[PDB]
Amino acid sequence: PETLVTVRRIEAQLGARVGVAVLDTGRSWEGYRADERFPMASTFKVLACGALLSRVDAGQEDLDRRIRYTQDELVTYSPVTEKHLDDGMTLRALCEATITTSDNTAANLILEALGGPKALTRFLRAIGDPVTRLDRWETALNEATPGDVRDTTTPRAMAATLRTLLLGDALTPASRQQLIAWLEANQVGGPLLRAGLPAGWRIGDKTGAGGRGTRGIVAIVWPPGRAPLIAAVYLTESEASMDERNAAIAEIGAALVK
């Protein structure tokens, strides 16, 4: 345990509810509040990309299909999608944008490709996830009012789902290596896991920030000469600053390397 004491202390010190799940890909198990629901924030974007890649694999979608869009469609935080109001972007470029930059319009453009939030939930069930749901678009989905089940996962379901997508058989080998490559190229989660992550280890991750103090991260990590580990760490319902909240998720992720 003792990684258990750190989580319990973080809840008591920060007034937060924490969810942690780790999956060793192994014959090991654990988790803290791992079947409670947490707001996904921008970690859902890994799932929407896997959803879209699954449609490509079925011949139902084209990664090179160009989406042309307008500026009333831009939602706050569009670091990439704003620079391409003129030419548009391909679906592949959009996927890259949401995983790499957490660009919110690219996410919405992918959700629209899939058929909306209700359709991502249907993919998730199709790949075995009975709990995780997406219900809104960016940025409404980060509202995270406590007790609301919209736009939620559980640490157990999210760790399981990421495994089925990244290492399981839900996606093609080409799609997995695309998603993994995007996650290894993530740029907005720096200190939460990567920073305390030893050199020589590979991490692909995706992080979320959301209202009511929501902070989340999902990650596949390859220790040196070991099977990958899937981690899902969520924190919410706290009034701490983004600083103490970042430092606790990093402190939980550090304890996991032990």
Numbering used by the authors: 27 to 51, 54 to 286
Reproduce passages from the article.
Most notably, the 70.a design, which contains 88 mutations relative to WT TEM-1, had a ~32-fold increased MIC of the monobactam β-lactam antibiotic aztreonam, a 16-fold increased MIC of ceftazidime, an 8-fold increased MIC of cefazolin, and a 4-fold increased MIC of cephalothin. All of the designs that enabled resistance to ampicillin in the biological assays had a similar catalytic efficiency (kcat/KM) to WT TEM-1. This includes the 70.a design with 84 amino acid differences relative to any known protein. We also searched for local structural changes by examining differences in all pairwise distances between residues, which showed small changes in a one looped region for all three structures (positions 255–257) and in a second loop of 70.a (positions 53–55). The G251W mutation, which was present in both 70.a and opt.b, stood out due to multiple studies that describe it as negatively impacting fitness in WT TEM-125,51. In the 70.a structure, new local interactions between mutated residues W251 and R230 and non-mutated residue E212 may contribute to maintaining β-lactamase structure and function. In summary, (1) 70.a contains many point mutations that have been described in the literature as compensatory, (2) these mutations combined with G251W have some of the highest predicted fitness effects, and (3) structural analysis suggests that local interactions between W251 and R230 (a mutation in 70.a F230R) may be important for maintaining function. However, the other functional designs contain amino acid changes that exhibit fitness defects in WT TEM-1; 80.a has two amino acid changes that show fitness defects, 80.b has four, 70.a has 11 and opt.b has 28. To investigate the structural basis for the increased Tm (80.a had a 24 °C increase relative to WT TEM-1, 80.b had a 18 °C increase, and 70.a had a 6.3 °C increase), we tallied the total number of hydrogen bonds and the number of atom pairs in contact (1.7–4 Å) in each structure. There are five shared mutations near the active site that are in three designs (M69A, E104T, P167T, E168A, E240G) that may contribute to this increased resistance.
